Write an enzyme that holds these catalytic residues in place. Structure first.
Site, mmCIF file in Angstrom:
data_model
loop_
_atom_site.group_PDB
_atom_site.id
_atom_site.type_symbol
_atom_site.label_atom_id
_atom_site.label_comp_id
_atom_site.label_asym_id
_atom_site.label_seq_id
_atom_site.Cartn_x
_atom_site.Cartn_y
_atom_site.Cartn_z
ATOM 1 N N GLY A 22 -13.896 -26.227 -7.442
ATOM 2 C CA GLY A 22 -15.339 -24.519 -7.280
ATOM 3 C C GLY A 22 -14.843 -23.669 -6.611
ATOM 4 O O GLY A 22 -13.739 -23.183 -6.228
ATOM 5 N N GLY A 24 -15.671 -20.337 -4.238
ATOM 6 C CA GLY A 24 -16.998 -19.487 -3.637
ATOM 7 C C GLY A 24 -16.142 -18.332 -2.698
ATOM 8 O O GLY A 24 -16.636 -17.709 -3.272
ATOM 9 N N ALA A 25 -16.865 -18.038 -1.833
ATOM 10 C CA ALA A 25 -16.975 -16.465 -0.754
ATOM 11 C C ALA A 25 -15.486 -15.904 -1.003
ATOM 12 O O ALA A 25 -14.837 -17.108 0.505
ATOM 13 C CB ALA A 25 -17.790 -16.311 0.167
ATOM 14 N N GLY A 27 -12.789 -16.883 -1.766
ATOM 15 C CA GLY A 27 -11.235 -17.804 -2.431
ATOM 16 C C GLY A 27 -12.321 -19.018 -3.264
ATOM 17 O O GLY A 27 -13.000 -19.951 -3.408
ATOM 18 N N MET A 28 -11.039 -20.087 -3.599
ATOM 19 C CA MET A 28 -11.237 -20.951 -4.021
ATOM 20 C C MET A 28 -11.674 -22.427 -3.159
ATOM 21 O O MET A 28 -11.057 -22.559 -2.111
ATOM 22 C CB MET A 28 -9.803 -21.435 -4.611
ATOM 23 C CG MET A 28 -10.054 -23.034 -5.841
ATOM 24 S SD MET A 28 -8.819 -23.088 -6.212
ATOM 25 C CE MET A 28 -8.240 -21.550 -7.700
ATOM 26 N N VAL A 29 -12.581 -23.673 -3.434
ATOM 27 C CA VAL A 29 -12.902 -24.617 -2.248
ATOM 28 C C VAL A 29 -12.054 -25.967 -3.610
ATOM 29 O O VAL A 29 -12.611 -25.989 -5.130
ATOM 30 C CB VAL A 29 -13.963 -24.773 -2.942
ATOM 31 C CG1 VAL A 29 -15.079 -25.422 -1.796
ATOM 32 C CG2 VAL A 29 -14.972 -23.278 -1.952
ATOM 33 N N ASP A 139 -29.269 -16.514 5.610
ATOM 34 C CA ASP A 139 -29.370 -16.423 4.020
ATOM 35 C C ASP A 139 -29.459 -18.110 3.464
ATOM 36 O O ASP A 139 -28.936 -18.862 3.451
ATOM 37 C CB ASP A 139 -27.564 -16.378 3.945
ATOM 38 C CG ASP A 139 -27.637 -15.937 2.243
ATOM 39 O OD1 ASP A 139 -28.885 -15.723 1.706
ATOM 40 O OD2 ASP A 139 -27.186 -15.817 1.658
HETATM 41 N N1 LIG Z 1 -21.975 -23.635 -1.241
HETATM 42 C C1 LIG Z 1 -22.147 -24.671 -1.717
HETATM 43 C C2 LIG Z 1 -20.639 -25.187 -2.466
HETATM 44 C C3 LIG Z 1 -20.759 -26.351 -2.494
HETATM 45 C C4 LIG Z 1 -19.271 -26.751 -3.273
HETATM 46 N N2 LIG Z 1 -17.816 -27.069 -1.447
HETATM 47 C C5 LIG Z 1 -18.226 -27.477 -0.954
HETATM 48 N N3 LIG Z 1 -17.888 -28.828 -1.330
HETATM 49 C C6 LIG Z 1 -17.760 -30.155 -0.718
HETATM 50 N N4 LIG Z 1 -17.782 -30.397 0.149
HETATM 51 C C7 LIG Z 1 -17.851 -29.025 0.936
HETATM 52 N N5 LIG Z 1 -17.647 -29.094 2.306
HETATM 53 C C8 LIG Z 1 -17.938 -27.776 2.509
HETATM 54 C C9 LIG Z 1 -18.216 -27.041 1.700
HETATM 55 C C10 LIG Z 1 -17.856 -27.693 0.493
HETATM 56 C C11 LIG Z 1 -18.708 -25.416 -1.029
HETATM 57 C C12 LIG Z 1 -20.034 -25.582 -0.831
#
Ligand SMILES: [NH3+]CC1CCN(c2ncnc3[nH]ccc23)CC1
Length: 338
Positions: A22, A24-25, A27-29, A139
Site C-alpha cells: 500500500g 503510507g505517510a 511513501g510506499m510500503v 494517534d
Molecule cells: N496503517 C496500517 C498499514 C498497513 C500496511 N503496512 C504494513 N503492512 C504489513 N506489515 C507491516 N509492518 C509494519 C507496517 C506494515 C503499513 C501500516
C-alpha cells in the site's frame, strides 16, 4: 535498482521478491523476502527531506521505535539508506510483516468477545509501556494496530507522539489539532493541547466501542461535529465537570446546548459483555481527570484472565530541516555495514 509501480524501491540485495502492500505517510510500503533472516518483512519507503514536518515526524518515530522494545509495539529491524548525507534521498524502514490491522479486520470480520478482550489487553499492555516512558502516542486508531495470523497485536505509527507535558496542556476553545478526528477526546475541542496520558485512553475507549459494533462510536464529519457526537452519547456534562472548564468560550458553548441524556451502553451494545461496558464507561469519561489510567484499565475485571503486572513491562527510562536530515542520518547509522 528494484522497481514496483515504476518507482524506485531500492532495498536489495538483502531484500528481494517485492510485492506492493500500500501507500503510507511520505511513501510506499512493500513486503519483501529478507535473505539474512529467512522471512518476508514489511518495508516502508520514506521521502521526507524537502519538508520540516515530514522530517520532524520521521525523526520522532525513528528515535522512539529504536529506544522502545516491547512485544506490543512494532520494532525497527533494519533501516536502509545511502552511505552519505548528499546521496540520501529516501530512507527505508524494515519491520515485521503483519497480515492485517484492526481497521481492515473491523471492516470485514465479526470479533468474538474473546478476541475483543485479547486485543484490548494487548493494546493496554503496549500503552502501559509507552506511558511509562512519559510518551504519548496521540494517534491511536484501528489502522495503527497491526495484527498477525495468530492475532498478536502491535501498536505502530509514532509520527505524532510527544513527551507528556501536563503543566502546559491548557489552551482555548476550538484550537486546531492534528490527530485523527473520530478518536479525539472531547477536551481537545474545549481546552486541551493533548499533552496528557488521558488523551490516549479516550482513543482506546473509542477503539473498544468500535470492536463491539464494527462501527466507529463517534463518527464526526468535522471539527466541532466531533463534540456533537460525543455529547450525543455521554449526555450533557455535570455541573462539576463543566466547572473544571475555566475558559469562558468553552464553558459557555457547553451551557448553550439543550439538555441531553446519557445513552446507556447496554442499549447501544446489547450483546456486549457487561464487564467490557463497565470498562468502556470508565475510558469514555468526559472529564479527563476522572478518566481511568492505563494501569487501572489493565486491572479491570474484564481483563482478569490476562492481567499480570509482572508480565506487563515498563520502560527502563523516561524520554531546521537541514539539521533534521543530519539527525536522521546519525540516528540510522547503526544499521550501516560497519
Ligand atoms: N496503517 C496500517 C498499514 C498497513 C500496511 N503496512 C504494513 N503492512 C504489513 N506489515 C507491516 N509492518 C509494519 C507496517 C506494515 C503499513 C501500516
Amino acid at each position: 535498482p528494484e522497481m514496483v509501480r515504476g518507482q524506485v524501491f531500492d532495498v536489495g540485495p538483502r531484500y528481494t521478491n517485492l510485492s506492493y502492500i500500500g501507500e503510507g505517510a511520505y511513501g510506499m510500503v512493500c513486503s519483501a523476502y529478507d535473505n539474512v533472516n529467512k522471512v518476508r518483512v514489511a518495508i516502508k519507503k520514506i521521502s521526507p527531506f524537502e519538508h520540516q514536518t515530514y522530517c520532524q515526524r520521521t525523526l520522532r518515530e525513528i528515535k522512539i521505535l529504536l529506544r522502545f522494545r516491547h512485544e506490543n509495539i512494532i520494532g525497527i529491524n533494519d533501516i536502509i539508506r545511502a552511505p552519505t548525507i548528499e546521496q540520501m534521498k529516501d530512507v527505508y524502514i524494515v519491520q515485521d510483516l503483519m497480515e492485517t490491522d484492526l481497521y481492515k479486520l473491523l471492516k470485514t470480520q465479526h470479533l468474538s468477545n474473546d478476541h475483543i478482550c485479547y486485543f484490548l489487553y494487548q493494546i493496554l499492555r503496549g500503552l502501559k509501556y509507552i506511558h511509562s516512558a512519559n510518551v504519548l502516542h496521540r494517534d491511536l486508531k484501528p489502522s495503527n494496530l497491526l495484527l498477525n495470523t495468530t492475532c498478536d497485536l502491535k501498536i505502530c505509527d509514532f509520527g505524532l507522539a510527544r513527551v507528556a507535558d501536563p503543566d502546559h496542556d491548557h489552551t482555548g476553545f476550538l484550537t486546531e489539532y492534528v490527530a485523527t478526528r473520530w478518536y479525539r477526546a472531547p477536551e481537545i475541542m474545549l481546552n486541551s493541547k493533548g499533552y496528557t496520558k488521558s488523551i490516549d485512553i479516550w482513543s482506546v475507549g473509542c477503539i473498544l466501542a468500535e470492536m463491539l459494533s464494527n462501527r466507529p462510536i463517534f463518527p464526526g464529519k468535522h471539527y466541532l461535529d466531533q463534540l456533537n457526537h460525543i455529547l450525543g452519547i455521554l449526555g450533557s456534562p455535570s455541573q462539576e465537570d463543566l466547572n473544571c472548564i475555566i475558559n469562558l468560550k468553552a464553558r459557555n458553548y457547553l451551557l448553550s446546548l439543550p439538555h441531553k441524556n446519557k445513552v446507556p451502553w447496554n442499549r447501544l451494545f446489547p450483546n456486549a459483555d457487561s464487564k467490557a461496558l463497565d470498562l468502556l464507561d470508565k475510558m469514555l469519561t468526559f472529564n479527563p481527570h476522572k478518566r481511568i489510567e492505563v494501569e487501572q484499565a489493565l486491572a479491570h475485571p474484564y481483563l482478569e484472565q490476562y492481567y499480570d503486572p509482572s508480565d506487563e513491562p515498563i520502560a527502563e527510562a523516561p524520554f531546521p530541516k537541514e539539521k533534521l536530515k543530519e539527525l536522521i542520518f546519525e540516528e540510522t547509522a547503526r544499521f550501516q555495514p560497519g
